[PDB]
């Protein structure tokens, strides 16, 4: 589980979620994920959490 | 990922956590995890959301 870029909102409490554009499928730890088109599809996570996970690199 | 017990509060935004436990270790998602040597291993993290159960 790893997210190259993660944004949360400046508040209490923190809210993150990883924008990155994986091709095809969603990583492992996601939840919901959302593919826009088919076949190399852009799915991305949707999930809200806490915090972040370290970065793909 | 998964989880058998599933705590979520009532607030927007929601706020879960995993109340399992485990002997050594936490389930792979779990970014920070707390072992207390009594054999007890639990994930802290807090998110909007549950995974589907383990079993």
Not at 7 to 24: A, D, G, Y
Not at 31 to 51: H, M, Q, V
Request: charged residues 15%.
């Amino acid at each position: 589980p790893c997210c190259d870029s993660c944004v949360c909102t400046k508040s209490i409490p923190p809210q993150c979620h990883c924008t990155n554009i994986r091709l095809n499928s969603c990583h492992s730890g996601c939840k919901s994920c959302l593919c826009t088109f088919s076949i190399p599809g852009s799915c991305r996570c949707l999930d809200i959490a806490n915090f972040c996970y370290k970065p793909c690199k």
